Every structure is written in structure tokens, then in C-alpha cells.
């Protein structure tokens, strides 16, 4: 059908159809008269997986023969989403499979919707891991993703009476055809026990053993015939475990609970034992695997052969575990072991929010990991000895830089451990990396300036353009060819088409097509009726006070009050769509969802409003819903308080897919505005410097309430029960926080946000100038490819050269 | 190689080799340089499974078109063992697969040893279910086995310091290639709740829901192209289950515990809630499946279309569940529902031991299954109304026949429920069926004589001759052809070869070959050295007081004491092998294992004994060890106290495989001796009548101790610590039971057992007369085919005609 989906040759189609019917019979044990659409999906998944296998085996063999330096990406989260379409895209099989399924009287798009998301992540950090695996395979790096195979991923969100309800994400119920169990590479992980000091050094004894069973998932590069591995560990009890009889067998579940469920907190630390167990489990099993592979090629060459990247502090125990193995088991002396650890490990920091920083109570580590605590104390002593020698007399610096925090309960600062034990520390956007050097890690920067880098985040243009927006990919490919899909900088060639009438028409047509398709999706799957000629105002991301969905709520109520004030005046019609999950224990995030649905209940049923303003809560926001709504979006809301969003990656997905951005100078918004030009971006609100000035004199929200009549009216409506008639006080906690305890200064940005939103409506009234500004955004989105990000990690941290050369098929 | 293993045609071998390499690459994602023997086993298993699929789909389609009467075999136990060799035997693929694997430089026998036993049973009852599925497929019955997919089967037995240790049987660790998950046929099962009485009848409300997910395993018939289904249910929590958040997800394990583990008690009732849950779970899910299939063809025709066979009382709740569905959900009146239930259900009783009878406390049923208890009370009232009308004034009969037992705690007699609710009640050997009518069910027999039948147990000659003893199968097939494998009565043709020198030579040669192979197996796998020219004296079966492994221990010690008394006299050398598992909580059974190993420790290290007497405890006795040891056996020990072994099936396996039997007139021993002639059987000990006479005057063990010097010496040796030097009192519980609390009268049979064992040694000294007696046993074993048993169930209980006609391939 469309060129970027590849060829449908007669031989390929015949062969796919034959293998589809072979899997339906032999694999699924079904004839055509009893097959459900789910059987058809599985037959196709098995058929496409077959094309991966040769390339996967040859790629792993190629890395054994060439023995390049190996990259180990350690994350507690991989937000993969669906695998079927992505595999077809990267193997150029999409048109052939479309043709093959069509000739069997099946619709491939209907079969694609049956696949469960692998929702093994919360949001940005988990999805960044997924984008990275894709870029590492596309750039031909010998890279392995290592994580946990959670039985239950991020919970399914149901809205019930406008409230979030959580259901278990039973994503493995029907089987996962993409994974291969490797029970033969099962490894022991130890917990509890105690330390004996012998003549021959320290001994970790009387431990409980949990087994780590690996599951391998193929990660195909973009048409380069490279297939890398994501290895996820599953917890299994040993068979002597507890071994009255019946209860001992049932108690095996205590050990297997380690890999049962993903902690659903985004940017919030919860010091739970089960979470520390998950962290050690993935680190212990992964480091044994790394060392085993290294010995099958003296530890001086280890850092020439191994890079370990830490996705935040979640796998920070990699540093003490590497020391423990090298000192206790391999009998290297401390200093040599430490040289090897630092040259091997690099640390990516993802937030400055202090509630997100991992600070593990010492009593937890003492009980669960007594040897690691000893090694952490030793690391701290030697580290503070270097601080004292560099800053003699600066006793306050010693307290601030300690890995050990004094107070009510002694805690380990896992970020301090990562900086001490890593040769490189990076933030995830330039403003974030500058804030790390100026504020939270200023002391560490003064000691070791050379360690601190920036690696601005990115997204894979395979999932986030070719896969989710084939219509846009195609009209681009018509003018500048297909090379941009693995070289996104080539999108700059589109700036020479900004005054081309045909290209303007095509860009606007694809947007309209995407909006019609998404409006229909809403009607079928959720019986809701939206005007597809309205501006699609989209804020999708986890529900958090710092992301200021509440600021968006204040704008929506302002538009409502303006319409009711002057019902017969023209306003640009908008559909305001807000979606995202709240962490189950985050009361305020749960109240914000309820406010969004309560506003919708008033706004969507007011006959005076008409189809001029619709407010929709998008339920169960996840990777597969992002692929549908982002190509449909006109306006991207990136409205975090300046200094709180380390980078963001949603911002980039929308820029790539033909939405204009309204945003603060926060995270990667700053670099996006710089790439496109400030004149092609709806920037508003306090900069970082303005927020600091407000903090010095003190944030008084009352001042804004007293001076802005439009704002006072909204707050009185919230308080009085305008939006909750049956429960007049329902939103008293929201009003109370906004007036007295707002860390994120929602009122301070209100006036400038509303005024900037008027400029958006004004430009939307002029379709041609809207579309020309969109072209200027798409054309400058190239920097925000994860291929650029990963090439920067490869050259400046890992010391390996990316390659775009094909392996032989 | 040998004819009964089928043809190895060039095309077949080429095709198997091609599909083996296809599965190794595509299914296992392995090249030949990294493949382990386990990968090779899996490649072959997938290759053979491929040949099942066409026949499985066609057979299920044939039953849909022809709509025959359906047989539902309900059991809590299916003791399947390994599937690979059995599948090859029944598809005639064994020689082709032997050839195919040989040409790839692999040994198929080495690959077969990598398969885990499906140990989803305890012993005889579980293995009888497995033999039956094989016969039902071979006789072309539209039959379904329904059970529980236990995550953990019967525990692996380790011997540590001569003591039994249990380990979890993690049989699914590496995957089960034989099963197909059918998550689309998932069904809800209800527990707890309460009963509302409406105007429109009773309503079971406020229940907890567990899901039953079925796994289908193919059951191939013998070369008839029929493949029946074994459907096993797995427990899954619903996704709203408990749905703070983390703990709700972890608590899903409470519901999934239902299918976690097989209760490891053989002939012992334990009234545990989890066990009652397993019983209801398999019954509820199975009856919904049966009714669904029936509606996809008015309940008058239900018994013309459905037979439900109950494997003991374990699924007795099928009777109240069928009533509950028919009355509460389908709105039939009581009397019609009851007519349908009785005509559908038949009950097989397997024991007379009172500790084996299921008597569920009312408080358990009241809480877990309140509606079933109401229906059971109603059944009891109507049943006792029929008893009172037939036996007016006999108030004692009313108390004895009640489904409800009065006492400390009220209990439901599940056997009484099964007799009341079933059109047929059978025992499992003629003597057992006579004992049911004379003693434990005498009152039920007088009310409904027509219900009571015999169906003498049998074994499948596929697993138990062709598969485990190919050498014997072949020398038989040389003289009388292959037809006997599905018509075992044809073995009578062997009586005309009892004086043929060549056949005598071949029978003795196969036995010798089997003994050499098993002696080597002992050396490799367990570093033990046995004389293969000794008599192989084998007692293998679960460890139980009624099976009198202790009587065998007394004989072994008697031989030891006789050798030590007269060291320089000739005795027929014996290897005494005893094997079996004790239930983990059965103290006495655990002490007996320890006595066996303690005797071995004295006997096997006495230089005066030499290789004249060896005592071996065979560790981890299970179906795959039975396939090795039974063909190696000379003497089969079937030495249960008369009246305790309902049938036995080990007895039959040994008769078929060329061992002579030493046994009591118990269970099927009686019919085996009748088939072969008493002169070709080593019968000893009390008959049932003699045991009754001993009970009337009272069993005084002291009398035997006082009158038999050889016995007194053994008891003094046990007491004094001859067999436990470090712990002189180790066996005081054994001596104490034998002297004062022996329910099974071990001393009463001692003299006759030892004398009969001398007759065995005497006949073994004459190889030609030993082998002629063996031929008389093999030649008369035809009755003990499960094909005969299942044809008798089919004609006299289920009302269907068996068929030996092939489906088209
Ligand atoms: O770099 C990828 C994205 O990371 C997000 C980010 C920062 S901390 C965090 C996170 C995610 C999951 C967590 C689970 C347990 C404890 C702490 C956690 C912190 N996620 C940041 O908030 C985004 O700005 C950024 O784009
Ligand atoms: O008919 C098959 C065989 O059944 C055996 C037999 C009788 S009761 C029983 C059994 C097995 C497992 C059980 C689990 C829980 C509660 C009671 C149970 C009873 N097994 C009998 O003991 C054997 O004689 C007979 O050959
Ligand atoms: C990209 C993505 C995110 C991250 O979005 P931000 O706006 O950067 O917070 C979260 N969830 C999903 C499903 C995503 O695809
Ligand atoms: C046949 C069999 C049994 C039953 O043997 P009995 O001697 O009748 O108790 C028990 N276990 C296994 C493994 C069997 O194969």
C-alpha cells in the first residue's frame, strides 16, 4: 500500500501464508472453523518471530567471534509495549504480512489490537530504556538489556464514578510468544545470612537462595539484520526450599514474590523490603551473567570488555556487588577492584525531586545484605578521605557528601554511591545536567568535574513515527526518501518545503486522517462523541503535582466560564484530552483524576457550550494508547513548573508527529524550542531563575487569588461545590493545597498560560500558518532521535563506535 | 531393529530429521554447537507431537459430527509418567525416530531419560486412571479425562542417612511440550457465599470466584489414529481479585494455591480445607464443560449423551453439583434432576480401609459449599424415606445408611452419597466386590442389589509390555504375531510353546538381558554393585502397614541369620529390592524405610554373606523406575494381609513381564492364580476367612513370638540395637506395634511366608522349570489388560460399544 512499509513480493506473501497455516495447525492446534481472532494473532506472531530466529542466532554468534566491548543496560523498568508491528517494521515485513493476512481474509490491524502491552514500566524512565534498546540494535552495538520479568506490569486503570480503580495487568495470561525461557542459565541469588571474617578474608554464609531464571526477548535493529537480547529474570524457589509438607510447597510463593509485580510509583521512593529484594535480584543475577560471558572470551581488561549503565539508582547495588565478587570471590585487593568498578560503571540521574531519591534505611541493608553494607561503609570511608584531603577543614562538605545520612534513622544515599562508584554521571537534558552541577551534586562536581556529562533524551523514530504514523512517514519519504528513519537529522531537508502548497496540504490531510481515526476509536471502544474539526489539546503522562494537570484544569474552567459569560461569541472549538495513571497510594493524584472527570460531567452536558468545548479523560494511558493519540494531537501540553521535569520524552513524540507545543522552559522543552526557534513554540511562565526568586521572598498564592478575578471565580466554584453538587466539599483538599501548600506554584503561571493559550487559538484559526509552523517543528525534531542519544553514550561514556552496516541476512 | 517398533522408511526418517532440525532452530532457538541433550529431547518431543496434531483435530471433529455418548473419567489423580516413548509406540514411530536420531549422531534412549514423569498421582488409583485413558483411546471411546494440573506432583524421594527426605517435584520447570493451554475455555468456580431463598427458588450469592483454565494433553490410541483429550484445570485469580495495591496482587497466590500441589497420601483421608477446594474445583469446572458440550449437540437425553465415572469419592461433589445446576440454574424439579443425576453417575470404590474413607466435617461444607450441604441433606432425607419404606422399623439401618454421621463432629459419608446418587457401584477385583456386598455396603446392597458390580482392574500392555520390555514383546511377536498388543487374550497361544526349547531359551535370555541392563543402571545412577545371577526379589509399591514390607523385612533377616548360623551351606543368592514412598506425615511408613536401609547396612557389609544376599532400597519409586525394575524382576512380592489390597496393579505388571508371584489370596492375586493355575503361583498365608477367625478370638502376637524361635531371635535383634548400634532403641516403635498393635497380623503369616520362600529358592535352582512356570504366567495374563476392564465398563456401566476400527490417518 505505502512505500515505507516495504515490498510484498509474490514469494514472500506465499511463504508467510504457508507458515501462518502451519502455525495455526501445529502450534495452536486449531482448524479455521474454531480459530478466534486471538488464535489468528498468535499464528501471525509465531510467523513473524520465525524471521527473527536466524538473525538472533547469527548476531549472538557474531559477538562471540568478534568479541567487541559489551554494553549492559541495567533497568528495573522496560516499557516495551507491543512487539508485533515493531518487529514487522524493523524486518521490512509489514506490507508482505498485510498482503498475506488480507489474502486469508483477515485484517492485520484487528489482529495487532489483540496483543497485550508489555507494561514493565511506569512512564518516561521505563520507555527511555525501550527506545534505547531499539537504538542500540539499530547502531549495531553489542548491547543487552537486563531487568525483571514482572508477572504483573503497570496496573490497568478503570474509571468508576470518575475515580481511578486499579486491576492487575495479567499480561502473560495467554502466553508471550516473543520470549524464550532459558532455564539452563538459571543462577542463584543470596539474601540475609551474616559475615564471617576468616584468615582468607570475609565470607557471606547462612544465606537464603532464590534462583533467577532468564527469559530472552529479541530486540531487532532497523533493517540491519542485528537482533540484540533483552534478558529478564524470573524468581524461582530451589526444590529443597522449606524441605509440614503441603505448607512448605505453598511457601515457595514467598521467594517467587520477588518478580511478581512492578512497583507503580513514578518519581516517588517507597523504602519497602520487597523493592530492595527486586533491586538486588536483578543486579546479582546480571553481574554473574556478565562475568561468566567475560571469562568465556585477569580483570584489568574487564572495563575494556564491559560497560554497565545504571538506569537511575534502582540497580546501584551493582557497585558494591561488583566489589564483593572481585574482593571476596576473585581475591583482587580493594584498590584494583575499585579501579575496575569505576571504569566499568556509569550512572544516569533522571530527577531532582527529593522524594524520588533512593535513601535505604541501614537496618534494611544490615539484615538483607550485611556484606554489601560493610562494602558501602568502606567505600564511604575511602571517599570521605579523598574529600578531606581536597577540602581540608570543610567538615560540612564531609557531612553533605557522605554516602551515610545521619538522623532519626541512618540511610544510604544511593545517588552518592553511584557518583562515587561511576566514571560518568549524566543528566537527561542540558538544563537538568546544569541543575545537577549547580545544586544537588555541586559538591561532587567540585571534587570530580570530569565525571559530569549531559546526554539529552530521545525517542526511537521507528515506534514513534514509522509505526504509529505511517501516513506522515510516507509524505515525508515521498520528498526526501527513507534514509531519515535511521538518520533523523535529514528531516531538516523539510525546511525547503515550508512554502510548498502540496506538502502543506499533505501534512494537514495526514493530521485530519489521524484525528478522524482517533475520534472513531473513542466512539467504538468508549461510546464518546467528539468533533474532529476541534483543536485536539492533549496532556498525556503520569498524574503528578509537578506536571500540573491542575494548571490545565484551571485553563479548561476559564474557557467554560468565558463561554457562559458570552455564549454567542466565537471561540476556536477544542477537545481537551487528559490521560495518565496515578500511583495507587498518591491521594492528590487520585483527586486530580476525579476533578478532570467532574469538569467533563459539567462541561460536556451544558447545552450552551455545544461541541465548542469537550473534556475527555483518556482511560488506561499506556504505550499502545500513546501510539494512537499522539499522531491525532494538535497541541502538546508540557507545563511542568520550571526545574521539575528532568527531560520529558512525550514532548518529543508530539513534536515528531505534527503537534505544536505549549510549554515552560523545562527539561528538553528548552532544547526543542532552541532547535525549532522560539517563534515556532508556545513558551510561557517562570524560568528556573524566576522560580528561585519566588522561593527567596516566599510563594503567597493568596496574592494571585486577590489580583486575578478569573482565578478567584474558579477557586470559589471548586469550594462551593459547582463541580460536585452531591458532595459540596469533595475538592476541599485541592483548594487547600493550591492556597497554602503548592510546591509547584500553579497560580504563578496561570495568567501567562491563559494568555499563551489565546495565541494558540488565534494561530489555529489560520490553518496554513498553523501547518507551516508544524513543518518547522517536524523539520527540526532530528536531535530528539534516541540514535543521537545512544551515539553520544557510545562515544563519550562506553568508548565504542556505533555502526550502520548490515550483518548478512 | 526389532519388528514391534514399526518401519523406518527412508522418507519417514528424512522427514523426522528435517522437522527435528526445524524445531531445534525455530522452536528452541539453538544451533548444533550450543544444544544440550535437553534441547535435543525437546526438539524430538516437538517433532513427535507434530504427528499427533492432525489425528487430535480429526478425532475431536469426528466426535462432533457423529455425536456419540461421551465418557467423562473424573479423577483427582492421573499418574501418566513420561509421554515421549508412549506416543512413538502408539503412532508406530519408534524405529523411524531411533533411525532419525541415530543419523544425527544422537542416542534416543539417552534423550528419553531427560523427560520428567508427570507424577500427578500417589500410586494404584492414579496409575489406573492413566491405563484407562490409554485403553479408552485404543477402544475408540469418545472419552475425556478430567483432573487438576498440579504445579507439583508426588514429591521426589531422597534417602539421607537411610531416612526419606521429600523435595518438591518441579516437573514444569523446563516446560511441558505435551500440553496445550486453552485460556479461551476459562470457567468460573464459586466458593463460600450464602444461600438466599427467593420466590423463584434458592440462589447461591456473595461467592468468591476462582477461574479454572484448562490444559489439554493428547491421549493417542494404539495405531487406530484416535487421539482423545485429558483436560486438567489450573487455578487463576480474577483480575479485580482483592482490587493495599502490592499486597492485593501478592494475595492472588491464595486462590492459585488450589492447583499448586498433589496431596501425597495413599489410602489415607486428611480432612483439609485445601483438599475439599481441589475436589470442588475439578467438579465445578468439569460439569460446566460437560453441559456446554451437551447443549452444542431438554435434559431427558443427558444420560443418553453423558456418562460420568467417579474415581473413588474424590469427585463425589459431582452428584450435588449436577443437582445444583439442574435445580437452581436450569429449573428442573427435584425428581427429574435426580433421575438424570443417577443415570449419569457411576462410582468406583477402591478400598475397604476405614481410614481411607472420605468423611467431611459438616462445618467445612457449611462454610465452603453451603448450597451443596442443603442439597446433600435433601438427598439424605429422600434416601432414608426409601430405606424406612423398604425396612419399616429398622431404625438401626437408618442410622448406618445415613449420608450424615452423628458424633463428636457431624460428618458426611461421601461413599454413602456416591451409592445413593449413582446407577452403578463397582469394586476393582472379584474378592473386593464380594467384600463390599458382604460387609461395608451390605445395607446398600440389600436395598439396591442391581447397582453393585465387579470390574477387575487391569494395566495397558502398551506401556507395561511393548514400551518397557521390547525384547519380550518381540520374542512373543516372533511366534504369534503383533495382534496380541491390543488383544492380550491371544497370549494364551503361548501355552503351546511351554515345551519348545528355543522359546524357553529366549524367555530366559530376555530376563537375563533385562537384569544386566538394570544392574548397570543401579551402578551408573546410584554407585551400587549387584550380582545379576542372583534371584531379583522385588517389592515396589507405596510404603503402608497393610502391604507388609515388614513381613518382607522379617524374611530378609531370617535369611541373614540362617547364613550366619551355617555360613558354608549353599543358598540361592538373592538381591532383595524394596522401593516406595511414604506419605510425609506417616511416621510408621518412614520408620519402615529406615529399617530397610538399616538391614542393608548390616547385610551388604558382612564379609561372610558375600554376594549371596543384597538388600537394596530403590529410591524415588515412580512410573519411569517401574518401567526399568519390573522387566528385571524374577519374584513379585504381593503380600498384603488378606482383605486389605482391593486389587493391586503392580501384581499384573510383573505377571506380564516374566516374574513369578509370591502372594496372599488378596485382591487380583486371587484371579491371577485362578488364570495361571494355583500350581504356577506361590500362594501362602491366611485367606480372608482365616483373618476373620483370628479377629473373633483376638490376635495375640506374643503366641507367635513364644512358639517360633527364628521369630523371637529377629525381635530380640531389633530391640537390642543389632540393626542400630549408635541408637539401640531406634526401632522400639516397630517392635511395640508388632507385639501389641498390629492391625495386619505380620507374625500370623510369618511361618507360611518363610516356608513358601524356600519353595521359590528350590524352583529357582532349576532354570528350565522356573522358565516353564514363567511361560504359564505370561500366557494367562490376558485377563489383566485394561482393554478387557474398559470393554466391561463400556458394555455394563456406560452403555457404549468399544470399536477397534481405525479413523483415517
Ligand atoms: O529520563 C527519563 C524520564 O525519567 C523520569 C523519571 C525521573 S525519576 C523516575 C522514576 C521512575 C520510577 C521510579 C520507581 C521507583 C522509585 C523511583 C522512581 C523514579 N522517572 C523524569 O521525570 C523525566 O523527565 C524523564 O524524561
Ligand atoms: O484400584 C486402584 C488401586 O486403588 C488403591 C487405592 C484405594 S484407596 C486409594 C487412595 C488413593 C489416594 C487417596 C488420596 C486421598 C484420600 C484417599 C485416597 C485413597 N488408592 C488400592 O489400594 C489398590 O488395591 C487398587 O489396585
Ligand atoms: C513517552 C511516554 C511517557 C513519558 O511521557 P512524559 O510526558 O515525558 O512524562 C509516559 N507514558 C507513556 C505510555 C509514554 O509512551
Ligand atoms: C503400578 C504402580 C503402582 C501400584 O502398585 P501396587 O503394587 O498395586 O500398589 C504404584 N506406583 C507406581 C509407580 C506404579 O507404576
UniProtKB/Swiss-Prot annotation, chains A, B:
Binding site for AMP: 31, 64, 292-297
Catalytic activity as recorded in UniProt: [(1->4)-alpha-D-glucosyl](n) + phosphate = [(1->4)-alpha-D-glucosyl](n-1) + alpha-D-glucose 1-phosphate
Top-rank taxon, per record: Eukaryota
Cystine pairings recorded for this chain: none
GO molecular function, one term: nucleotide binding
Residue(s) carrying Phosphoserine: 3, 402, 486, 719-720
Site for Can be labeled by an AMP analog, residues: 144
Keyword Magnesium assigned: no
Keyword field: Acetylation, Allosteric enzyme, Carbohydrate metabolism, Glycogen metabolism, Glycosyltransferase, Nucleotide-binding, Phosphoprotein, Pyridoxal phosphate, Transferase
GO BP annotations listed: glycogen catabolic process
CDD domains attached to this UniProt entry: GT35_Glycogen_Phosphorylase (cd04300)
Enzyme Commission code: 2.4.1.1
Residue positions where Phosphotyrosine is found in the record: 192, 215, 445
GO cellular component terms, A-Z: skeletal muscle myofibril
Keyword Membrane set for record: no
Means of activity regulation: Allosterically regulated through the non-covalent binding of metabolites, being activated by AMP and inhibited by ATP, ADP, and glucose-6-phosphate. The activity is also controlled by post-translational modifications including phosphorylation.
Modified residues (N6-(pyridoxal phosphate)lysine): 653
Cross-referenced NCBIfam families: P_ylase
Function: Allosteric enzyme that catalyzes the rate-limiting step in glycogen catabolism, the phosphorolytic cleavage of glycogen to produce glucose-1-phosphate, and plays a central role in maintaining cellular and organismal glucose homeostasis.
Designated name of the protein: Glycogen phosphorylase, muscle form
